[PDB]
Amino acid sequence: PDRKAAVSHWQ
């Protein structure tokens, strides 16, 4: 896998 950060500001 591509082991990568992402931002989650979901509600």
């Epitope: 896998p1 082991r3 990568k4 950060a5 992402a6 989650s8 500001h9 979901w10 509600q11």
Partner: nanobody, 121 residues
Framework: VQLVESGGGLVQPGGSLTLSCTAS????????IGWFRQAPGKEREGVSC????????YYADSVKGRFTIFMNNAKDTVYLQMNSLKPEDTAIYYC???????????????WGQGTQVTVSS
Amino acid sequence: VQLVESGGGLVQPGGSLTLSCTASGFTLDHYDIGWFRQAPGKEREGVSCINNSDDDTYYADSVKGRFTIFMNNAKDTVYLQMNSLKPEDTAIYYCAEARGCKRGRYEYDFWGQGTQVTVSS
């Protein structure tokens, strides 16, 4: 679980797409699964997440209303319905396991190459 994406394309603004996130036909109802995207010049962001055990769904403010994340009765696919697409929605879209649908900045295992969505007139 090794998930991958399908359903991209180039659509005109105002159109729609349905993306699919699958793991070889295995059922997904145990997992929490996020849909993410990485647009040109932008940080990779989570746009929608489903907690399948608890029946919760989460949306980024930029997509709420327009996007929905769901399974159907087969439970083999996490769909992303994307309505009223705008140029700003152009990105590679990725899916991954997102335990708890946590907010913040975590690392994910992106097993798929993503699916390109281009919204262009």
